[PDB]
A paper describes a structure:
BAR protein endophilin B1 plays a key role in multiple cellular processes critical for oncogenesis, including autophagy and apoptosis. BAR proteins are typically dimers in solution, where the dimer consists of three α-helices from each monomer that form a 6-helix bundle with a characteristic crescent shape.
These different classes of dimers will be referred to as “center” and “side” dimers, respectively. At lower contour levels the disordered region appears close to the BAR domain, brushing the membrane surface, but not inserted. H0s are oriented anti-parallel in relation to each other. As H1i is disordered in the center dimer class, residues Glu76-Ile96 were deleted from the model. Locally refining the classes individually resulted in reconstructions of 3.45 Å (center dimer) and 3.60 Å (side dimer), respectively.
Numbering used by the authors:
A (entry chain A), B (entry chain B): 11 to 76, 91 to 252
Amino acid sequence: LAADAGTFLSRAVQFTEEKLGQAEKTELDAHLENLLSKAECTKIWTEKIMKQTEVLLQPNPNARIEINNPELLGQYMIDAGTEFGPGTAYGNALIKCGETQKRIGTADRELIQTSALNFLTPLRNFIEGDYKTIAKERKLLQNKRLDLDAAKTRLKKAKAAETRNSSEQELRITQSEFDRQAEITRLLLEGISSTHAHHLRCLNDFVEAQMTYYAQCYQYMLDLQKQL
Amino acid sequence: LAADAGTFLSRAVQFTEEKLGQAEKTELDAHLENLLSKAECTKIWTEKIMKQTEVLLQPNPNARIEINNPELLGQYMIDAGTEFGPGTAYGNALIKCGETQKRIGTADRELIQTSALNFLTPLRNFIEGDYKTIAKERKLLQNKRLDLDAAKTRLKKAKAAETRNSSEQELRITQSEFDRQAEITRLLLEGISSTHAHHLRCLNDFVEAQMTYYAQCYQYMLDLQKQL
């Protein structure tokens, strides 16, 4: 209850003095330190790639917030050709081109849905399922470290019998707690390795989707050329 | 000088009477009417098609007013690969994919240059030339028609035989200018026939451009698949 509030205040004091430079800072084991850094970079890069991919798939920002451009152009062409006269060669071409443009529009929508269910979703799930969990452990680990240094300062300021005696007992518990949290954090950080391999498989899926999209559109264009 | 004001007054008054329905309106010959309508329709439809084509090629409105999305995504992927370790399989894939994404971006830029100069330019030229010239002559033709109807109104209101004879001469003068302007506009309207044939060749060029873009992109994607 109220005790919770007091503990928070003490933590800030230690943090400030460390930044002030009048206090030193305990360093985590290199292995754990390296693991923490690796996870951070993974989230940073994955976020950027996913966001830009969405912009590429749906160029219209308003549509991304939400008829695709290709089909709209096809609609105008068909209507114009009818007015210009279906028999007239110019009208004939406009009508056929409009139809082909609409077929291309269909292929685009298929690609967007396919990519989202095989690429955007898995990458997003990683941050939602793994990163968020790791974030919680990271915060708790830092909290324990702050308390350890705070007790250390008291032990350094040993000027009385009870001070020395209590400091030793207090530090013993603080050290053990920090060590316990370290083990749990290490385990989760170890899972990141599998995350990379999983993401690799999803990347292959995105590449395949684009190939199919371009192949379908190419054939559609070839047909229009023959008809025209 | 004062003549300018006088001419405006006569035209507006007669027009208002016709609008009110109290005054009758001299109609034009069917041939000229048909030609004028055809030209107007051509410009309206051509304007819409060209504008939508611009949106399709350059989805970004700001860029349309002026790096492409594909190349930017390529940059992110290559950078991430390095951090994740070029040797690492995940890093290798990210780097290769980014490179191909930039190549696709390059082909897009070529299409924009090729298409705009072979499709948008001609459509715009027609609207900037054939239509405008016709509109100017069409406006003067309406002014001449108003002068003719004003002369007819003066003629019917010319109770005095001598005044009516003067109105007959005035009517002949207005009729001659009116007929002359009709012929001038008619000649410009005949030009729209050639515009359609020219526009058809331009449409074929736009189709060819799109086919090349899709073909090149397909090959690029195929190569990336093999390397990965």
